[PDB]
């Protein structure tokens, strides 16, 4: 189970946050700030997985924007890297050569892309065409 998904930049400011566990807002901001400082206090050769409170944090840099996921101690970390890559590919297939600016100005559309891919911390749509196709029909549905 993916507990939460965080997106942030090189400046540490958050770009997207989806939480599949229930915990209050002060603990939310504290956990997010310390996790952002843990990821940003690491180099580019540092194995892409950190250990944090019996949850392995799977992160992967793509641009100035970072991508991060937190899973339990039963999941696959490399398949969580593939889950991050599939979410980046779904952002590619929706927006079309996606940059950070599309995430910043369409955070709600990136949220819809995450909801068409992951609900409850688990994958609902494995494939790439079905999720983007469902977002396209919900976009012309209005």
């Amino acid at each position: 189970m993916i507990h939460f998904i965080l997106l942030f930049s090189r400046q540490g400011k958050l770009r997207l946050q989806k939480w599949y566990i229930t915990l209050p807002d002060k603990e939310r901001k504290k956990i997010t700030r310390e996790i952002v400082q843990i990821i940003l206090s690491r180099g580019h050769r540092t194995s892409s997985f950190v250990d944090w409170k019996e949850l392995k944090l799977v992160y992967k840099r793509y641009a100035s924007l970072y991508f991060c996921c937190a899973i339990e101690n039963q999941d696959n970390e490399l398949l969580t890297l593939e889950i991050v890559h599939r979410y980046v590919e779904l952002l590619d297939k929706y927006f079309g050569n996606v940059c950070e600016l599309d995430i910043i100005f369409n955070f709600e559309k990136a949220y819809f892309i995450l909801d068409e891919f992951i609900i409850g911390g688990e994958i609902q749509e494995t494939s790439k065409k079905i999720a983007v196709k469902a977002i396209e029909d919900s976009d012309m549905l209005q």
Partner: peptide, 9 residues
């Protein structure tokens, strides 16, 4: 910098 493509290509 921010207008740069997310995928590595």
């Amino acid at each position: 910098q921010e207008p740069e493509l997310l995928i590595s290509g």
